[PDB]
Design a protein around this ligand. Structure first.
Ligand SMILES: Cc1c(C(=O)c2c(C3CC3)[nH]n(C)c2=O)ccc2c1c(=O)n(CC1CC1)c(=O)n2C
Ligand SMILES: Cc1c(C(=O)c2c(C3CC3)[nH]n(C)c2=O)ccc2c1c(=O)n(CC1CC1)c(=O)n2C
Ligand SMILES: [Co+2]
Ligand SMILES: [Co+2]
Lengths: 379, 379
């Protein structure tokens, strides 16, 4: 069931912010690898003496890449006189974040009706404040609370172009790449203990819980179930070591594990991304064995044709089925040096009337199907 | 003249090492932007719990990209029991380097006959030791001395595959990109005071000095003038602010300013790089005005045809002339967030009998030619 218990009005995912040591190189690699266009910047060329921030967009998906400049450039500034376009930015926090975790997500940003209200109600309901509400050029308000580890939930509200102080990039520099990615479907955290993490986040948002190998997890969802925030914990004591525990070890604790990006055509997206894997883009996890694709006919043969299921086989796409929809999904290798953050590409089919959130689930059934296919490929 | 005063036997440039916060993303961006292949790795997959290091190669050019892992992965190790493939690596030095300077060159590595001898003679002649000689698997010896700022000169000698502990990357991951770059021609440092820097470096190497707008510079060279190490200082008090001083400000002091990469066909290299500028590669400095290319006929018309000089005009190539050879050159925009390090692409024509080093100079004459062309394009 869906009690619609959101303690404030939540709209959609707004952006994901990566904290890096060099925003330029990460943003260029991601743009080519994922087919995202350069759309806005805030940096020295725009008067920002504090941080370099570059925004990539594909459909409604917004990826922001930020790194600190030398603190010496802004030594004369005080918070009232700052040239930073994102007032929550702090040199010491950013350098500490990146040296501790490496490349990763700092902020999961959701658009709300009123960011100051969302912040107040959140903290009144247990949220740990991270950055108080600040109004930007009488137009946009942003506030931040702690989510898990060093990741924050960022509230953004607009009265009536990304953020004040960001400039649109010249289209000579803005090449219209597009591989079909259209929006952020869900953002997943890894924590040591799932119980306290769930109680905390569900406590200050009012998100409700949305309807065996390595992990336990649960999905918090907004009223219309379009902001989806799953959380995982490790399952210790197994033959194979939990990838959640490996994450916590290499990340130095809790953090964002994967971003799932919805594509309007996952076959085109994966053809385009795989073309670029070895020339600067992203690698994908190893494909499942043919026994997997042999056994799909008897499970999804009603939704996908024999050509398409074979087209899944070339690209290594996995498929899972809910009682309401079907899910196409595939996972990249880790995005940076450490075995921590990765990306999932997904497409959902079903649950129409617009599409309802979570249609098809998150692919939990693909674990035992993978195990069964591996047990059957040695035969 | 060339006194051939090298205090030890120096061969050629061996590699350039970048210290980064995420080696993966920088190495992938550089590989696509410059047309360099992935050739070796030392990381978690090879047993290195200390640093991730990825090597790119194009012809004889070797770019190494290194970043630290969490120190927790190697907390039980001592220097005798280290899994680091580069024993000079230090987590604290690397994090301090990158937070201070951002993305930049840590090591300029030259191949010598005997790295222990080169280190001893260097320090006996004033070099500041950085890392003592260490023998790797009874096969390779590496030692490091301070060069300028936080940049070190790294000596490498081989008894008889990059370094012990590096693995060749699977050719499924190794795409054979090549845009024509073949070797490192020179590596240039920026310092506050040129005099003391020259006296220091020439003092411990025996390199000799190799034969007005913003800078003073001088070029130290090895016996055969194939290791070329120019150094710049700012010229203060001008109408336009020195780019050397801007470098020192944004870099937090002295460091490596530019790498010049020789191409066997600069026209093909710049066509290939410019195709990729807006899809993840490198941007170039603004092209000179047509008045420049109008005035080349009367200076290089004897070496380049009218088609090629027009082909220079499309690509924005600059041309300068020595009394012994001619030089084709162009500069990228800065490689990362800060206005610090950039790359020069060059091709030299002349001085044959093999090609002698520095053929054509370094393009000093292109300053006044550029000024004159700008004064003549408003007419
Ligand atoms: C991350 C993930 C998901 C997934 O996206 C989500 C889950 C799954 C319950 C985990 N719950 N929620 C909310 C999700 O968004 C689904 C299937 C997967 C994996 C995955 O990582 N590996 C490789 C790692 C195990 C070695 C797999 O083999 N399979 C089959
Ligand atoms: C770096 C550089 C070089 C060059 O490579 C080297 C030099 C030159 C004396 C500087 N000496 N040595 C040893 C060299 O390797 C040559 C010409 C240049 C520039 C350059 O940066 N800019 C733009 C900056 C000035 C605003 C220019 O307009 N011109 C024309
Ligand atoms: Co998922
Ligand atoms: Co040069």
């Amino acid at each position: 069931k869906n009690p619609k218990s959101d303690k404030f009005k939540v709209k959609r995912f707004h952006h994901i912010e990566f904290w890096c040591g060099d925003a330029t190189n990460v943003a260029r690699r991601f743009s080519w690898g994922l087919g995202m266009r350069f759309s806005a910047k805030s940096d020295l060329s725009t008067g920002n003496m504090v941080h370099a921030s570059y925004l990539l967009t594909s459909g409604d998906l917004r990826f922001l890449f930020t790194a600190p400049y030398s603190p010496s450039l802004s030594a004369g500034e005080i918070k009232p006189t700052t040239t930073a376009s994102i007032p929550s930015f702090d040199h010491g926090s950013c350098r500490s974040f990146f040296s501790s975790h490496g490349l990763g997500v700092r902020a999961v940003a959701i658009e709300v009706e009123d960011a100051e209200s969302a912040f107040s109600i959140s903290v009144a309901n247990g949220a740990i404040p991270s950055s108080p509400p600040i109004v930007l050029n009488e137009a946009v308000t942003i506030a931040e609370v702690k989510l898990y580890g060093d990741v924050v939930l960022r509230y953004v509200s607009y009265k009536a172009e990304f953020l004040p102080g960001f400039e649109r990039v010249e289209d000579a520099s803005s090449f219209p790449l597009d591989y079909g990615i259209r929006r952020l479907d869900h953002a997943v955290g890894n924590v040591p203990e799932l119980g306290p993490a769930l109680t905390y986040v569900a406590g200050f948002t009012g998100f409700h819980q949305f309807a065996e190998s390595g992990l336990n997890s649960a999905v918090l969802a907004s009223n219309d179930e379009m902001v989806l925030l799953p959380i995982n914990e490790p399952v210790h004591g197994t033959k194979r070591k939990s990838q959640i525990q490996t994450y916590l070890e290499h990340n130095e604790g809790a953090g964002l594990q994967h971003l799932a990006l919805m594509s309007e055509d996952i076959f085109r997206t994966l053809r385009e991304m795989r073309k670029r894997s070895s020339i600067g883009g992203f690698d994908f996890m190893p494909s499942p064995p043919p026994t997997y694709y042999q056994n799909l006919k008897k499970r999804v043969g009603d939704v996908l044709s024999d050509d398409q299921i074979k087209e899944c086989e070339e690209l290594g796409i996995l498929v899972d089925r809910d009682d309401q929809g079907t899910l196409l999904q595939i996972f990249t290798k880790p995005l940076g040096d450490r075995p921590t953050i990765f990306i999932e590409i997904i497409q959902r089919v079903g649950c129409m009337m617009y599409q309802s959130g979570g249609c098809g689930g998150f692919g939990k059934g693909n674990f035992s199907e993978l195990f069964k296919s591996i047990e059957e490929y040695e035969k």
